[PDB]
Amino acid sequence: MQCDGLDGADGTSNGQAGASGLAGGPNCNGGKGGKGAPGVGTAGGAGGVGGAGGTGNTNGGAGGSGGNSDVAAGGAGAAGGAAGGAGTGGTGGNGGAGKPGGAPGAGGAGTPAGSAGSPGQTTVLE
Amino acid sequence: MQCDGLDGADGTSNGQAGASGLAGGPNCNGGKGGKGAPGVGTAGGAGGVGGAGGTGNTNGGAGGSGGNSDVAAGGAGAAGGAAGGAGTGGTGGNGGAGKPGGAPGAGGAGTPAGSAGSPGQTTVL
Numbered sequence: 596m597q598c599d600g601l602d603g604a605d606g607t608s609n610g611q612a613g614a615s616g617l618a619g620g621p622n623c624n625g626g627k628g629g630k631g632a633p634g635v636g637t638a639g640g641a642g643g644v645g646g647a648g649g650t651g652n653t654n655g656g657a658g659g660s661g662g663n664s665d666v667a668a669g670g671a672g673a674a675g676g677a678a679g680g681a682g683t684g685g686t687g688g689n690g691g692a693g694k695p696g697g698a699p700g701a702g703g704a705g706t707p708a709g710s711a712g713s714p715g716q717t718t719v720l721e
Numbered sequence: 722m723q724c725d726g727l728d729g730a731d732g733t734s735n736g737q738a739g740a741s742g743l744a745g746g747p748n749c750n751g752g753k754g755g756k757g758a759p760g761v762g763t764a765g766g767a768g769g770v771g772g773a774g775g776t777g778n779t780n781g782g783a784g785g786s787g788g789n790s791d792v793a794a795g796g797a798g799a800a801g802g803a804a805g806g807a808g809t810g811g812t813g814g815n816g817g818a819g820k821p822g823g824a825p826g827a828g829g830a831g832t833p834a835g836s837a838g839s840p841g842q843t844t845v846l
Binding site: 610612613614615616617618628631634636637638639640641642643644645646647648649650655658661664667668669670671672673674675676677678679680684687690693695696697698699700701702703704705708711714 | 729734735736737738739740741742743744745746751754757760762763764765766767768769770771772773774775776781784787790793794795796797798799800801802803804805810813816819821823824825826827828829830
């Protein structure tokens with residue numbers, strides 16, 4: 596960690612995926628991935644990937660989480676970016692809530708690595 | 722069923738992430754996530770997420786695989802998208818090879834669910 600990476604835009608339109616965070620420039624951490632948009636009558640959007648760290652000792656960006664869905668599946672969370680050098684890996688995004696929940700995103704490698712995210716929350720009839 | 726125009730773009734510059742696959746429209750499978758680009762000097766990019774299946778009975782899209790790296794970490798593989806209805810979940814992508822190899826992507830939910838991907842190989846010596 597020293598300079599910033601460019602974050603990815605969150606999805607906004609129905610079911611739209613988040614955009615990836617950018618790979619860091621020199622001495623820059625990777626950008627955070629965008630969140631996926633909610634889905635209405637359709638599944639949620641996927642998260643966008645977290646960016647890899649740039650040259651030097653840089654951290655990976657966090658992966659975006661997936662969007663929730665009202666009647667369908669959540670979007671999946673995106674992976675975190677890997678570190679540069681001796682930096683820390685990005686945390687994976689969480690899946691969106693839905694039926695069923697989206698899968699989690701993996702952590703990016705580093706020293707230490709980032710953790711994978713959580714699956715999205717699901718609702719069950721009793 | 723596979724529909725046109727849903728696959729995410731592959732990364733095309735050093736370390737760039739793959740783009741996520743698009744959520745399917747009605748009766749369409751989710752799109753495949755893009756492949757992460759390799760890294761030279763820095764880490765590989767992670768793969769893009771697979772899109773969720775559309776309404777009806779649809780398959781989730783496969784997650785993209787991560788890029789390799791020469792001296793740094795491989796990019797992570799991406800999660801597969803969830804099925805719609807009674808469809809099959811998408812397969813998770815594979816991690817890129819590197820120091821160490823990237824984490825695998827999780828499978829998407831379905832009946833049956835997608836399998837997780839393979840970790841990237843860790844290169845030594």
